[PDB]
Design a protein around this nucleic acid. Structure first.
Ligand SMILES: [Mg+2]
Ligand SMILES: [Mg+2]
Ligand SMILES: [Mg+2]
Ligand SMILES: [Mg+2]
Ligand SMILES: [Mg+2]
Ligand SMILES: [Mg+2]
Ligand SMILES: [Mg+2]
Ligand SMILES: [Mg+2]
Ligand SMILES: [Mg+2]
Ligand SMILES: [Mg+2]
Ligand SMILES: [Mg+2]
Ligand SMILES: [Mg+2]
Ligand SMILES: [Mg+2]
Ligand SMILES: [Mg+2]
Ligand SMILES: [Mg+2]
Ligand SMILES: [Mg+2]
Ligand SMILES: [Mg+2]
Ligand SMILES: [Zn+2]
Lengths: 66, 174, 66, 37, 141, 186, 130
RNA sequence: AAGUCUGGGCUAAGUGGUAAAGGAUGUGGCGCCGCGAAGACAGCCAGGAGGUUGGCUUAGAAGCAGCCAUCCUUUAAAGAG
């Protein structure tokens, strides 16, 4: 989740995430972070390493388009 | 969920003899007599001793578990025997036998001399380890307890008499 | 330093050792000289220099006004 | 020992025993030791 | 705290605490209630003490219903005077409460949060109480 | 959604006596009949805690009959908060006036803000046919903020069921919560 | 009663989909060992065919209700059912015996195995890949 | 003066034989549920995991200063604790 910092718009998330969104991404930019950090996880899919980005999509608050 | 109905495995060759209110456990290391409620019935099978409740109310369920373990501790008593170890920690502190007696040096101006009652024997391997040994589980338990009380573990330092396995818990001292 | 209403600022290793920086009210410093030495088995020290002025919380300042 | 009219479990390692006619609360943390009275 | 904005009469006779509640016996607002098991004059300070206790337990959350009101004036003679020379002065207000009355109700908070808050509030009250949960029997009234 | 409950006949048996025997005194009636009855307290309670005055109850009587009823009113023991008497309304082909449950579907925007949805009406009175008796009456409350409100006029109502109270009546609302920040002045 | 009824579901199914399912003792294994026998037995066993890891009582009721040989290996002790026939193996049990007979003490184990449709014996199913 | 009267039950405090809020594995009788040979409860033997030092903070807050957020994944199982 280092890579979802330079593909959102912020360097520091969104203060109080979940209610205010200050940057976002599509259903395929979720996959290019999946493309790099792939041996980084315990999975070997693409829509499994995208659900582990669409699940880190609310730590900083950078939501997803879908 | 029940200590009393559990069967008491009697090793060969120790002999459990039954009587009104008592059972006699004779073995390789000695003999011990166990007081037993007349309400409880001790009964002797083959290589196994059992205990039965005349009823299912409190007083009897309570006496039940107790009685079987009382006998079982005597059984184990005369066969394998019982022992506790005491771990002396602390700089100045060290121990030794003086005859059958035990001499404790534990920071008092005077050294302390404990003398073993009948059936209890003291061993001092290392001068920081002491082994209280006997066939009566409760008497071994007591003597151990008495000795340790002479200088209970400090609450601020690893200093004093310790049970083997006793964890060393300490608070800061300012 | 917390029990002196002091607000922390930093930790770094110097002579190693380990150096700290902090914001602390002049008031809660008297004989900190001697407290530190107890808190650190006499193995610690400090330097201390003036910074600024700021608000005293409401429930202390008024006692002075008699 | 705390001695009081309302003895209570204070933490989850506290234990209510009852010895010799009195309600005690014993615990690994000494501060939690209670007698009722 | 609580007291009538204005009264038709300033002091009133004492009366008696005979019998169960006239009404106020079922839950009619919240999810849980606190109900009196004994008769008493509940003082305004006792109510507000109970109230404040519950809000403080909720801290930002829940809703508190108060179903009794201290409309009864409490009189007490000036300290250390002898008997006579009229009825005393009004010194506070109380709510008359008989067994079965629902004094407080909470709503829109967890079961646990309601239970502890009602339990706590009950300790501020000079009588025994039981906590209740709104059931079908209540709604049918 | 339809419940059955055993129910016996009584004449001059003291309600006190019956109440002791674990039985609940009661009566059944409509336009046409009136009978002094009694049911087992414990069984009735198990039934009533889901039926209420909403869902139907049929009384299997000691003669064979099985009349479908609604609970009209239940008398409580004020001191002990326990039931001491039931009125069972024997239903017929006629339309009937009754209380229909409200489901409050949705999570109010007012709630999301620390607010609290006060369900001012948990059921609603209604003219309906014993055959056309619903179960739910759903109400969207999600669009409500602090402090907004709904008024039974805002109810939908399935075909065959008529709002039996004044539409000016308030059903549910969202108010501010208890806050310790308020205690500052309290 | 309970989700143990929804446990006879997946176990019957995934088993009645085989005939050569082995049984291992997926015990001791640490954190790395918890992804070792797991992902590597998908490097010689298709689908999620390493272990199913199920109640020994439940697998006993399966191989008994689905009549599949009634695998009377010794289903006592920690067991987890090495799926060789949800896979593509038989001598790719070499992949399991490998890291097993290497990593830590006793690593992964064996004690029973259905043989194609029959009964693979003791060290039999533990040498029918060595 | 007249029963150490009969039958059923409870109480182990000398309660009976001087008191309240409140506290309690005291004892006994009820009751309604929950888990349980598809193996529950107790103890005990494994594991109890990765994306992730979860956003940013403090110089460190890395599951538990601490706020908001709080998913999925390899799973028998494992809460962004
Ligand atoms: Mg000396
Ligand atoms: Mg010991
Ligand atoms: Mg207290
Ligand atoms: Mg607790
Ligand atoms: Mg303990
Ligand atoms: Mg008067
Ligand atoms: Mg008063
Ligand atoms: Mg009270
Ligand atoms: Mg009315
Ligand atoms: Mg009730
Ligand atoms: Mg009832
Ligand atoms: Mg007699
Ligand atoms: Mg006494
Ligand atoms: Mg007495
Ligand atoms: Mg007395
Ligand atoms: Mg009781
Ligand atoms: Mg167990
Ligand atoms: Zn404790």
């Amino acid at each position: 989740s280092y890579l979802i910092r330079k593909a959102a718009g912020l360097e520091k998330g969104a203060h109080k995430p979940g209610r205010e969104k200050v940057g976002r991404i599509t259903w395929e930019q979720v996959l290019e972070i999946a493309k790099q950090k792939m041996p980084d996880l315990n999975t070997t899919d693409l829509e499994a390493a995208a659900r582990m980005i669409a699940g880190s999509a609310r730590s900083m608050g950078v939501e997803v388009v879908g | 969920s029940r200590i009393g109905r559990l069967p008491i495995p009697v090793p060969k060759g120790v002999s459990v003899e039954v009587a009104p209110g008592r059972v006699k456990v004779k073995g390789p290391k000695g003999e011990l007599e166990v007081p037993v409620s007349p309400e409880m019935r001790v009964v002797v099978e083959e290589g196994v001793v059992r205990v039965e409740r005349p009823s299912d109310e409190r007083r009897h369920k309570s006496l039940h578990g107790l009685t079987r373990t009382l006998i079982a501790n005597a059984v184990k008593g005369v066969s394998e025997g019982y022992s506790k170890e005491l771990l002396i920690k602390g700089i100045g502190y060290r121990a030794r036998l003086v005859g059958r007696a035990l001499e404790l040096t534990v920071g008092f101006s005077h050294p302390v001399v404990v003398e073993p009652p009948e059936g209890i024997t003291f061993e001092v391997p290392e001068p920081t380890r002491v082994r209280v040994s006997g066939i009566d589980k409760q008497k071994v338990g007591q003597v151990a307890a008495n000795i340790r009380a002479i200088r209970k573990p400090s609450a601020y330092h690893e200093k004093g008499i310790y049970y083997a396995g006793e964890p060393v818990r300490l608070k800061p001292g300012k | 330093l917390n029990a002196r209403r002091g607000q922390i600022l930093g930790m770094e290793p110097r002579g190693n050792a380990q150096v700290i920086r902090a914001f602390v009210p002049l008031a809660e410093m008297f004989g900190y000289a001697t407290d530190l030495r107890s808190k650190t088995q006499g193995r610690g020290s400090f330097v201390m220099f003036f910074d600024h002025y700021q608000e005293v919380p409401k429930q202390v300042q008024e006692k002075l006004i008699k | 020992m705390k001695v009081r009219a309302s003895v209570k479990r204070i933490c989850d390692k506290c234990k209510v025993i009852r010895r010799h006619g009195r309600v005690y609360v014993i615990c690994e943390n000494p501060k939690h030791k209670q007698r009722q009275g | 705290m609580l007291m009538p904005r204005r009264m038709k009469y300033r002091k009133q006779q004492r009366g008696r605490l005979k019998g169960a509640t006239k009404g106020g016996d079922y839950v009619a607002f919240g999810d849980y209630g606190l109900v009196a098991l004994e008769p008493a004059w509940i003082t305004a300070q006792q109510i507000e003490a109970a109230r404040v206790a519950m809000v403080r337990h909720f801290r930002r959350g829940g809703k508190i219903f108060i179903r009794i009101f201290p409309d009864k004036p409490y009189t007490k003679k000036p300290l250390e005077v002898r008997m006579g020379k009229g009825k005393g002065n009004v010194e506070g207000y109380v709510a008359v409460v008989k067994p079965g009355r629902v004094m407080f109700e909470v709503a829109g908070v967890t079961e646990e949060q309601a239970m502890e808050a009602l339990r706590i509030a009950g300790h501020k009250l000079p009588i025994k109480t039981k906590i209740v949960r709104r059931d079908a029997y209540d709604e049918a009234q | 959604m339809e419940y059955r409950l055993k129910a016996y006949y009584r004449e001059g048996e003291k309600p006190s006596a019956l109440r002791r025997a674990g039985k609940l005194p009661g009566v059944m009636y409509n336009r046409h009949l009136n009978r002094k009855v009694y049911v087992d307290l414990v069984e009735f309670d198990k039934v009533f805690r889901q039926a209420s005055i909403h869902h139907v109850i049929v009384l299997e009587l000691p003669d064979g009959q099985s009349l479908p009823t609604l609970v009209r009113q239940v008398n409580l023991d004020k001191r002990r908060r326990r039931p001491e008497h039931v009125d069972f309304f024997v239903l017929s082909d006629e339309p009937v006036e009754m209380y229909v449950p409200l489901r409050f579907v949705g999570t109010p925007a007012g709630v999301r803000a620390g607010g609290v949805l006060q369900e001012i009406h948990r059921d609603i009175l209604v003219k309906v046919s014993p055959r056309n008796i619903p179960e739910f009456i759903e109400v969207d409350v999600s669009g409500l903020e602090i402090g907004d409100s709904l008024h039974a006029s805002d109810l939908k109502l399935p075909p065959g069921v008529e709002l039996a109270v004044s539409p000016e009546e308030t059903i549910a609302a969202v108010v501010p919560p208890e806050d310790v920040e308020k205690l500052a002045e309290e | 009663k309970r989700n143990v009824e929804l446990l006879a579901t997946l176990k019957e199914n995934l088993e009645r989909a085989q005939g050569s399912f082995f049984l291992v003792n997926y015990q001791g294994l640490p954190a790395k060992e918890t992804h070792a026998l797991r992902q590597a037995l998908k490097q010689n066993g298709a689908r999620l065919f390493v272990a199913k890891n199920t109640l020994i009582r439940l697998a006993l009721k399966e191989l008994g209700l689905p009549e599949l040989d009634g695998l009377q290996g010794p289903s006592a002790v920690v067991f987890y059912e090495d799926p060789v026939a949800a896979a593509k193996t038989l001598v790719q049990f070499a992949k399991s015996n490998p890291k097993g007979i290497p990593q830590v003490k006793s690593g992964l184990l064996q004690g029973q195995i259905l043989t194609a449709k029959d009964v693979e014996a003791l060290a039999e199913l533990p040498t029918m890949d060595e």
